[PDB]
């Protein structure tokens, strides 16, 4: 089966960052999402106790205004400033969006599950401008749930403008909810590296609690830091506390023209860098990546990674989530849909669209676009695709995957019954071309793509 | 796995009239839809010639006003009366709805592909009140396409009021389009019977061109005759001429409150008998069987048969068709959905609803209703069911299918991790109960049913 390069680019992108299933990546063992999640929850502790899973929690948090001591022995306490308060609340919300958690602020003398405070000096009273931050697991002991940040670091004081600050807040709150570093190390013990990782997917691409940069797994965020839980963090936190099924249950738009009211899902112009793993609990949803000019690769399959706005591996979709639609930008893109009915819009540029299973509606947009079919099940009669903007002599429909069972032949107006034949039928009253494919092994003609517009035999790649 | 009687009634109804696949039914070989279709098209002739498949046709028809002779040698020509003209046009439309055919009437001296005329006497000139009707295959010979009906039969003169007349018209037009009797016999040659059938599905339940009554295969139309192509006729006619993808591509309602403008799909009150195989080429469609009080069984799977309004095996869905929604009546019904997102409404009575795969929305209605789940894939987190009218202490949710992998246990607020556990979670802010099931072999909790209302542990059948 010598397939086309368009089909091959689909086949390959579908397998981008494959994981688990006895693979080995970077010479390391590969963990599935669930295995990573179990690893990141290995301490088996949460605010509900030890070995307690799937249980929701209503927690309190507090910005300490003074302290009698700090449990690590650091000193020079300094309270949260206004920007730190707002970003920390944004991090909290990023967790509660995905797991069944509620956060309620307390003040005064009230105790709280999670606290926030800065330090500036060590126990000897000397200025500390080297460290970053740390936090304590849930539990009943003194300091359980407390998180502490080095105020002499500008990223900690200005986390709204220095991405590592917000990231750090999300990470440390994670530990305070019960999550661990994917690998058994802790900042300040020798000189560990990614080579020390237990599993390949121990990196920022997969967990915001990882020690290691996204580059260690092949992703590239161009110097930016994602500020929200990543795919393995979502599975992990949900393991402890349950998934939040009330989040964004309407028709949700992620990227440009977003209606999320979440900074990490929202791009207001082309310079914005998106780094997120999406959680969405209902409705018909869209990845609008329309404002970028880079060549992008957008995959709608749950658990899968995309390359958006010039970054690599920066967008993923959490396990348990179904996103329905995608819009590329002016670059030459690949859009891969999932088993749901997807609307895909390639935008300008020469795009490759693959709707996969389900009744998909495809707009190639401006440019020389290619609509790819990988199997008879992609477009059955009972649930057929529409291609709604096909341009004869310009776009292509690619059926080369079918060569693996004998190359298709075109017929003009009738099928012979031998199978593996492709026919185009014009319906003048409606201006629709029906593309029929009689596949080997099928007694009846079971594959149909309807096209709003004319198409020529030479537009069809067999 | 001792499963519940509710689940068993689903499992069984899903296999109602199973066919093909090396089964033997009534001691005969069982044909799939496609095999029956090939058998019924065995003459391999159509208006496009011989051995020509999948090719559309634009045909003419004519009500002869006089004849020089009738090709069978019968005599006593009598032209169509007004009711015969209207019913014959209804039969023609029943064929063109399903296959790519157009029918245009001609008059005067113009030749036509299909003609209609009555006779009343044999070649000896004696009155014939015994025979019924006959027709001639497409071809170039004299009489090709002609159809002829015995005017001394009241069912032929009053086909709008005597169902066998309309049926006969649909049947004979079928032969004039190229279809054959499922078995090699012809009225007037000895005394054949269903025992002579080549395959089991040679009956009115499957083909309006069959010799044999629906009772021969276990169906029962209570003395009525279906007037429209049945499931094997649809596949057969489509084999010759192609499927008509422009038919009823909007949101179509079949049964009560129908918007089809087809008498055979329309019931205006509870005494109406429905007998149809549905063809539908797009949109979100409903089987509204709400006006009956009989216990009904309604299956939405393509190719499947239902028992509607007190009849058995009287409704089916053609291959290539996806119907999305179903409404039962006041009887105790079973509604089985398909892999699509289905809305099922049980109506009054004690109903069993099974949404199958996809994100289904279920209304049990009045009565003690049972919502049945047969597998983890019926209601995944990524595409979960809603039960929107659940009545605590009255309805049931049946998870007994899961016993085949160990009986589920209830847990109150947390999962242990051992799997096969079921949990109910109340969300007071929204008044929703989330039913979670942690299934054996699943590392994460992957099955969820959301319920608009409270539910008790004792409402859940494990
Ligand atoms: Ca949504
Ligand atoms: Ca969705
Ligand atoms: Ca593009
Ligand atoms: Ca799809
Ligand atoms: Ca394009
Ligand atoms: Ca284009
Ligand atoms: Ca598709
Ligand atoms: Ca429809
Ligand atoms: Ca439909
Ligand atoms: Ca009912
Ligand atoms: Ca379904
Ligand atoms: Ca009911
Ligand atoms: Ca009920
Ligand atoms: Ca379902
Ligand atoms: Zn850490
Ligand atoms: Zn006949």
From Swiss-Prot, chains A, B:
The keyword Flavoprotein does not apply. Disulfide bonds: none annotated. Ca(2+) 4 binds at residues 338, 340, 342, 355, 360. It comes from Dickeya chrysanthemi (Pectobacterium chrysanthemi). Its cofactor is Ca(2+); Zn(2+). Binds 7 Ca(2+) ions per subunit. Hemolysin-type calcium-binding repeats lie at residues 327-344, 345-362, 363-380. The keyword Repeat applies. GO terms for biological process: proteolysis. Ca(2+) 6 binds at residues 356, 358, 360, 378, 385. The Gly-rich repeats may be important in the extracellular secretion of this metalloprotease. Zn(2+) binds at residues 171, 175, 211. It comes from the Bacteria. This is Serralysin C. Ca(2+) 1 binds at residues 248, 250, 280, 282, 285. Its main location: secreted. SUPFAM superfamilies: beta-Roll, Metalloproteases ('zincins'), catalytic domain. Gene3D superfamilies: Collagenase (Catalytic Domain), Serralysin-like metalloprotease, C-terminal. Its EC number is 3.4.24.40. GO terms for molecular function: calcium ion binding; metalloendopeptidase activity; zinc ion binding. Ca(2+) 3 binds at residues 329, 331, 333, 346, 348, 351.
